[PDB]
Design a protein around this nucleic acid. Structure first.
Ligand SMILES: OC[C@H]1O[C@@](CO)(O[C@H]2O[C@H](CO)[C@@H](O)[C@H](O)[C@H]2O)[C@@H](O)[C@@H]1O
Lengths: 552, 406
DNA sequence: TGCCCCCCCTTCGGTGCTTTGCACCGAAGGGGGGG
């Protein structure tokens, strides 16, 4: 137990402590919980209480490991709901690509970090639990915590912030010693030669012990490779601890969920990982035990991933005297993969971006989002933004930010010829086309009936009306544009009265969750020239009036 | 000194907003700034048992290379009790918008000499991040009137008027308006002379304990019709739909004469000759468009709204209103950076200029409707912010159905 | 039969529009990883 001052905590206003009865348990668990708590009582982590304390939270018994030694955990779900909110100070996860090369490295853990931090004295009575007796022979043995319980909502933050306050004197005294503190795990690097470095280490251990934090020897790593945060720290490079993917004859939804999660974890260092086709399997499913047959595309993607994973890979460490460089490749179906490096073929890390934001988008927008994801990740890890290498031409980007009405930007980037390139798949003419037919399109739906029509008239005297079933207003308007593109030549002028349809199409999308919009896109890509114009409806205007006419 | 008792508005809790990532140079500056205010007792280290948080970052103004800490108290200010209800409030003076020049002074540090209600401090918590999450976040809360908090100009009102009094009755026709942590001070003297009344005002405040605007050049952009010798069906269609939109704003705008020249199913490129009755409609509409709209008056009890459109070639149109289509001001902001290659920087600068004009004119900033994706804005805007205040904003995706303002 | 954090992918439900469905966005469901 630390002599650090306790952090005052409160229940939420209006609420009392938990009063949850003890779910009965085996005479065996009963006696192991007796064993566990007599040793905690002699260490002062808990103390006996009686019936005058009215609170309770169930104590259940768990096998600690393969050895069969019993482990006690307390189900503070109910007390957690009644305890005040906290502001968590763990803002993120350190990444080994953010580390600089060091001469001397040490990895230490503190032992029973939680059970070494005292708990606010006035709050302890709410952590009361009861060990029951077989068949109610006795009332049972009640205890309460004097230290941070595992399973209480506030324990991780109070242990973390207590550790920060204890490390702070030592950190200020030695600014040339890097201490990464994650919960009870400490990485300590320096450029002092191992003799002076190990002096400072046991000095640090002694500081911790005066404040009640042991550092057991079995957790004191003195030699590379170091096991840290799921990685392996060698002097020149780093490593993920081995990734084992599920292998199944028959896959459940849950199996697939576990597979995608492993592949996303692997994607931080293994370039080119894809999960679009495997995650498609999760869609529309309705039970975690539902067996899902792999599609053909999913088997191929899994095999592609497995080939990548059998090759060994490593990341390098960060050299602050060189630029950060981020290179992106396009993978298809809205998937992007990236590497971040400082010297060529020496990746600090990798990643993937594959989210579809919006019902309708294009590759240029998604490239801009990938840049934004990488820019944020780079500030988290290295505190700065990388120079970019992108498979898009300057002419392409310039054509995009001059004809798109939203402000958009991407920082310093070099073009790199890495097919497939990102490109605009069509561009609407900014002026009407001489010699091209003019289509006046309209579509209307009856909100109550689900029925509608889409149609057009032209300056060449052509006209057409299609009946539509189970449709909407906005669909008939898209439908009307679909007809005009379908029946027109390579150059066309189209006048619509739907601001909605104009809005989607003028954004030059190249993919959509709408099949109707996807159909319009494939026709736009096949035209030579398209001018698309809006007019207000029901003002008896030009051709728009007669096509509206024709709709009814 | 004894504090002023402060409340949140009924049924509202303190801010609970996550800290966003920060560059190396901004974190270093915040740690330098805050450990020094720790030492001066202006803030105090706290822990996670305080459940409130407000983001913080830093800014370098382009001609002061010191860093300035900026806490984003927008959430806290919205939940804070009105001081106007409690009688403490800063009357906006008209006739600041008519001064030759107006300079902006950052005066937020005057607040650091007044303590804050012991029971309100917990709502002012913020957290400094760390690069690569080497440490957990470091949390502080204020013991004094915080910068950027709307309550600090109000609690400090009594005092600043006493600080300013000799200067203002020794200078009756200067006008001084306090907005948040800023002092907007304008008058008609020559810039060389105007500026040293600034620097004299500077020392007077320093011894008890900026940008250079010109309101007269803030011209309005009215909606304009094109002029040509000849007109196509497409030209007339565009014109008709643009005056039809303008009919929700102005009064007695007609499109029936120009409408029926497009009678029939015509080609877009066919040139339609103007009837003289249609030149009649267009000359008439053209100058209803000329002069401002009758019947539009500012209301102090309702919010200000600002809309912005990217027009291209560095240009940006904007409209400030309170009810839809009743514009108090329409304008056009222009780049001058000389770079010409960064849309996000231009929009961030446009927002600061438009909000500055609203402070000068009406005394408060508008809630902006920004023509940009949320995530593109949040990727970059703090790189270009220079104001000690931050306006409300929201993100819109409205394609141009008209090029109404161009 | 417990806690806290970051990530991705899917699903759901609230909001506002001068809408009647649509697009957006944040929260919560699963998974990965850390302690
Ligand atoms: O950009 C919006 C984004 O910013 C946050 C703070 O991180 O909210 C701020 O901006 C809003 C718009 O003005 C305010 O309403 C809010 O009070 C302010 O904190 C996020 O909450 C929001 O997602």
């Amino acid at each position: 137990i630390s002599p650090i001052e306790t952090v005052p905590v409160k229940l939420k206003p209006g609420m009392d402590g938990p009063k949850v009865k003890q779910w009965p348990l085996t005479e065996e668990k009963i006696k192991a919980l007796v064993e566990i708590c007599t040793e905690m009582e002699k260490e002062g982590k808990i103390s006996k209480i009686g019936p005058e304390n009215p609170y309770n939270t169930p104590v259940f018994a768990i096998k600690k490991k393969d050895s069969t030694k019993w482990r006690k955990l307390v189900d503070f779900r109910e007390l957690n709901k009644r305890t005040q909110d906290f502001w968590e100070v763990q803002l993120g996860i350190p990444h080994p690509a953010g580390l600089k090369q060091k001469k001397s490295v040490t990895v230490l853990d503190v032992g029973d970090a939680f059970y070494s931090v005292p708990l606010d004295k006035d709050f302890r009575k709410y952590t009361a639990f009861t060990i029951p007796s077989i068949n109610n022979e006795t009332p049972g043995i009640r205890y309460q915590y004097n230290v941070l319980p595992m399973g209480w909502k506030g324990s991780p933050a109070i242990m973390q912030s207590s550790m920060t306050k204890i490390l702070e004197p030592f950190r200020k005294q030695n600014p040339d010693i890097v201490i990464y503190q994650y919960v009870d795990d400490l990485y300590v690097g320096s450029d002092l030669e191992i003799g002076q470095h190990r002096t400072k280490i046991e000095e640090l251990r002694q500081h911790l012990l005066r404040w009640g934090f042991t550092t057991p020897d079995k957790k004191h790593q003195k030699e590379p490779p170091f096991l840290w945060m799921g990685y392996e720290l060698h002097p020149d490079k780093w490593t993920v601890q081995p990734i084992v993917l599920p292998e199944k004859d028959s896959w459940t939804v849950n199996d697939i969920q576990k597979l995608v999660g492993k592949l996303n974890w692997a994607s931080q260092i293994y370039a080119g990982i894809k999960v679009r086709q495997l995650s498609k399997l999760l869609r529309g499913t309705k039970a975690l035990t539902e067996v899902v047959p792999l599609t053909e595309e999913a088997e191929l993607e899994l095999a592609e991933n497995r080939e990548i994973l059998k090759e060994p890979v490593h990341g390098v460490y960060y050299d602050p005297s060189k630029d950060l460089i981020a290179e992106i490749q396009k993978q298809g179906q809205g998937q992007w993969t990236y590497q971040i490096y400082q010297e060529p073929f020496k990746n600090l890390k990798t990643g993937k971006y594959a989210r579809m934001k919006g019902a309708h988008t294009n590759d240029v927008k998604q490239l801009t989002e990938a840049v934004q994801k990488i820019a944020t990740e780079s500030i988290v890890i290295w505190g700065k933004t990388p120079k970019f290498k992108l498979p898009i031409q300057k002419e392409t980007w310039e054509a995009w930010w001059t004809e798109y009405w939203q402000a958009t930007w991407i920082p310093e980037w070099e073009f790199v010829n890495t097919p497939p390139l990102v490109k605009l798949w069509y561009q609407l003419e900014k002026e009407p086309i001489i010699g091209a037919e003019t289509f006046y399109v309209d579509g209307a739906a009856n909100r109550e009936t689900k029925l509608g029509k889409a149609g057009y008239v032209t300056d060449r005297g052509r006209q057409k009306v299609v009946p539509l079933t189970d449709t909407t207003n906005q669909k008939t308007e898209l439908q009307a544009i679909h007809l005009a593109l379908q029946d027109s030549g390579l150059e066309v002028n189209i006048v619509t009265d739907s601001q909605y349809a104009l809005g989607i199409i003028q954004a030059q999308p190249d993919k959509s969750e709408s099949e109707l919009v996807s159909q319009i896109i494939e026709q736009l890509i096949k035209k030579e020239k398209v001018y698309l114009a809006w007019v207000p409806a029901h003002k008896g205007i030009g051709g728009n009036e007669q096509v509206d006419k024709l709709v009814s | 000194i004894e504090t002023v008792p402060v409340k949140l508005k009924p049924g509202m809790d303190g801010p609970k907003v996550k800290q966003w990532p920060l560059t190396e140079e901004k974190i270093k500056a915040l740690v330098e700034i805050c450990t020094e205010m720790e030492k001066e007792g202006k803030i105090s280290k706290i822990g996670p048992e305080n459940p409130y948080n407000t983001p913080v970052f830093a800014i370098k103004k382009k001609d002061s290379t010191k860093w300035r800490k900026l806490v984003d108290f927008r959430e806290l200010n919205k939940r804070t009790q009105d001081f106007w209800e409690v009688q403490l409030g800063i009357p906006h003076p008209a006739g600041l918008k008519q001064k030759k020049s107006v300079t902006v002074l950052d005066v937020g540090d005057a607040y650091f000499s007044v303590p804050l209600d012991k029971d309100f401090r917990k709502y002012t918590a913020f957290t400094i991040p760390s690069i690569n999450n080497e440490t957990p976040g470091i949390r502080y809360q204020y013991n004094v009137l915080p910068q950027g908090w709307k309550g600090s100009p109000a609690i400090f009102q009594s005092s600043m008027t006493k600080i300013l009094e000799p200067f203002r009755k020794q200078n009756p026709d200067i006008v001084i308006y306090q907005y948040m942590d800023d002092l907007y001070v304008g008058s008609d003297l020559e810039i060389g002379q105007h500026r040293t009344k600034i620097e004299e005002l500077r020392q007077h405040l320093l011894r008890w304990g900026g940008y250079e605007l010109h309101p007269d050049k803030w011209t309005v952009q009215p909606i304009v019709l094109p002029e040509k010798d000849s007109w196509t069906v497409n030209d007339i269609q565009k014109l008709v739909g643009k005056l039809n939109w303008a009919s929700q704003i102005y009064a007695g705008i007609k499109v029936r004469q120009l409408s029926k020249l497009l009678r029939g199913t015509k080609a877009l490129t066919e040139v339609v000759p103007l009837t003289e009755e249609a030149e009649l409609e267009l000359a008439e509409n053209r100058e209803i468009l000329k002069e401002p709209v009758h019947g539009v008056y500012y209301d102090p009890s309702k919010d200000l709204i600002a809309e912005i459109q990217k027009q291209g070639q560095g240009q940006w149109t904007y409209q400030i209103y309170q009810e839809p289509f009743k514009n108090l001001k329409t304008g056009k902001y222009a780049r001058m950076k000389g770079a010409h290659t960064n849309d996000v920087k231009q929009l961030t600068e446009a927002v600061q200029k438009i909000a500055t004009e609203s402070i000068v004119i009406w005394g408060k900033t508008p809630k902006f409707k920004l023509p940009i994706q949320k995530e593109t804005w949040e990727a970059w805007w703090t790189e270009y912010w220079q104001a000690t205040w931050i306006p409300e904003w929201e993100f819109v995706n409205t394609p141009p159905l008209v090029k109404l303002w161009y």
